[PDB]
């Protein structure tokens, strides 16, 4: 499956980041073999036709284009990062850093809310968007 | 544990490899939608009737639906047993298990 077209070329991915400016660009640097990236792709497909009018999500393979995993240092098996009009917005997840999500978010509503908040912060220009979630914990009990 | 996504990917790959290049340009999404309709049909006791679809395609869709139903039933039973025992779950997992049950 993986209906989201993965930008094979690194320069193609960079141009795609420079392609759209009025919406949210999310790149899934996870390798499609691992099950975690499969769950991330499933979550994206859940929000594929929802956040489409406000965002443009693309997949990525760190093996295909390695420059993204060597310059941005995306060492996680499946890290979700955002870039808005040549500005990598930071989501205030609270996991020590804000460059990636790094978690296999199995909740479609949580992903949709995060996307909406990221879009609102990008519109407001805040480079560090306050994520409306307590991602610092496992959020399970 | 991930039988649903793996089975869907396998069925999609088999259908796409069987499908010709002349039909794999845009009808792959149609086949995926048909599989989704079959899945949602068996989960709500509503019959899935695609009389305009090939008989082997219908057989493959039915086999995939049966496999996914068996996997979902086993997963729901396991999750209900874990919840009754007192395992550590979350709100999303609890909601999904309650819906399946």
């Amino acid at each position: 499956s993986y209906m989201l077209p993965h930008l094979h070329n690194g320069w193609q991915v960079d141009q795609a980041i420079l392609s759209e400016e009025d919406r949210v660009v999310v790149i899934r640097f996870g390798h499609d073999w691992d099950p975690t990236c499969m769950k991330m792709d499933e979550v994206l497909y859940s929000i594929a036709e929802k956040v489409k009018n406000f965002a443009v999500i693309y997949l990525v393979d760190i093996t295909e284009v390695p420059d993204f995993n060597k310059m941005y240092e995306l060492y996680d098996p499946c890290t979700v990062m955002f870039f808005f009009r040549n500005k990598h917005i930071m989501i205030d997840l609270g996991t020590g850093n804000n460059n990636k999500i790094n978690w296999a978010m199995e909740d479609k509503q949580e992903m949709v809310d995060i996307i909406e908040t990221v879009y609102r912060g990008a519109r407001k220009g805040r480079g560090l968007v306050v994520s409306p979630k307590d991602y610092s914990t496992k959020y399970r009990y | 544990s991930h039988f649903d996504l793996e089975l869907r990917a396998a069925v999609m790959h088999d259908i796409l490899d069987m499908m010709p290049e002349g039909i794999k340009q845009n009808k792959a999404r149609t086949i995926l939608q048909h599989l989704s309709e079959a899945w949602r049909c068996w989960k709500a006791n509503i019959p899935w009737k695609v009389p305009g679809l090939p008989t082997p395609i219908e057989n493959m869709i039915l086999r995939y639906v049966k496999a996914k139903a068996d996997w979902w039933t086993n997963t729901a039973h396991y999750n209900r047993e874990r919840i009754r025992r007192g395992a550590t779950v979350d709100k999303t997992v609890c909601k999904k298990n309650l819906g399946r049950l």
Partner: peptide, 13 residues
């Protein structure tokens, strides 16, 4: 289109 990528991913898993 997506068929080739899906087949490639399936063949490695």
């Amino acid at each position: 289109d997506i068929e080739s990528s899906l087949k490639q991913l399936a063949e490695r898993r």
